[PDB]
Design a protein around this ligand. Structure first.
Ligand code: HEC
Length: 82
């Protein structure tokens, strides 16, 4: 239940989406790309916690430092989606 709540207080969706896409790829396209990578949360971590670009487009990522606890839960709801 905290998965949706975490993606809420975290406006990651404000820029991300699920079935529309605007600035970044919906958690589905990103969750599908890191689906074959059991270390998805790791890849998504260095991309947010350490900016990221040259992947989904020329638009880089802001400095989004999160705690391994929240990054782990947010990485489980993002990779699990539904
Ligand atoms: C608009 C300013 C954004 C906000 C706010 C957040 N994200 Fe984002 N994200 C955005 C873009 C444009 C992209 C694609 C960049 C590219 O060119 O590749 C992304 C991508 C991600 C990714 C995947 C990056 C990759 O696989 O290389 C993740 C894991 C991701 N974003 C996470 C994330 C989180 C947790 C956010 C809230 C803290 C968040 N994003 C906000 C644009 C924007």
């Amino acid at each position: 239940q905290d998965g949706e709540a975490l993606f809420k207080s975290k406006p990651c969706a404000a820029c991300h989406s699920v079935d529309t896409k605007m600035v970044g790829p919906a958690l589905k396209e990103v969750a599908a790309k890191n689906a074959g990578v059991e270390g998805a949360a790791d890849t998504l971590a260095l991309h947010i916690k350490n900016g990221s670009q040259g992947v989904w487009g020329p638009i880089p990522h802001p400095p989004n430092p999160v705690t391994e606890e929240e990054a782990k839960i947010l990485a489980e709801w993002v990779l699990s989606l539904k």
